[PDB]
Amino acid sequence: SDLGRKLLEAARAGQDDECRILMANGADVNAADNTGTTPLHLAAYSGHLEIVECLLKHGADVDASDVFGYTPLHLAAYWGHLEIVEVLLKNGADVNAMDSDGMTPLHLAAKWGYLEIVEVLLKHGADVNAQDKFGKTPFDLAIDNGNEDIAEVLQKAAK
């Protein structure tokens, strides 16, 4: 429908007030585009905290998956959006969700040097022993990407 699209675009562009109205007008909060990405994905992807909070308020599926197996949490960790991660986790996001390549949010965070986020994920039970389709663990990816401080943290959490 039109409302669904408007909502996706409003989320993408970070139009809080626009998104607000679309909710009032009965926009499908769980609308999906050609690649199965929902408004929550896009809000998490762009780093629009308030929109994320509003979407969740209106029953947005916190663990929705696109064609790549990506969930909002994956996108949040991917771009280093700390606050949004904490919110998604608070709303019952699967901290160990796996994408098409078997990557978990912890894999992504460790890979792209997001220390503070690595910590938050660990608090909520992120599995340090999870392996992607290459047998790589968050530790392996930390080391491979020259993020030593994070690697050291992960190593100490496994013991």
Binding site for Hg ion (CB under 5 A): 19, 54
Q: Which residue, 76, 38, 73, 80, is CA-closest to 59?
A: 38
Q: Which C-beta is closer to Hg ion: that of 19 or that of 106?
A: 19
Report, in Å, the least distance between residue 81 CB and Hg ion.
17
Give exposure, 94-126, as e/b (b: 16+ Cβ within 10 Å).
Answer: bbbbbbeeebbbbbbbbbbbbbebbebbbebeb
Asked if 52 and 44 count as a contact pair (C-beta separation under 8 A), the reply is yes
Q: Which C-beta is closer to Hg ion: that of 60 or that of 110?
A: 60
CA dihedral 8, 14, 18, 22 (to 10 degrees): 30
Report, in Å, the least distance between residue 60 CB and Hg ion.
9
In order of 12, 54, 133, 142, 156, the CA distances from 49 in angstroms are: 12, 9, 31, 27, 31
Report, in Å, the least distance between residue 62 CB and Hg ion.
14
Report, in Å, the least distance between residue 72 CB and Hg ion.
14
Q: Which C-beta is closer to Hg ion: that of 31 or that of 143?
A: 31
Q: Which C-beta is closer to Hg ion: that of 18 or that of 119?
A: 18
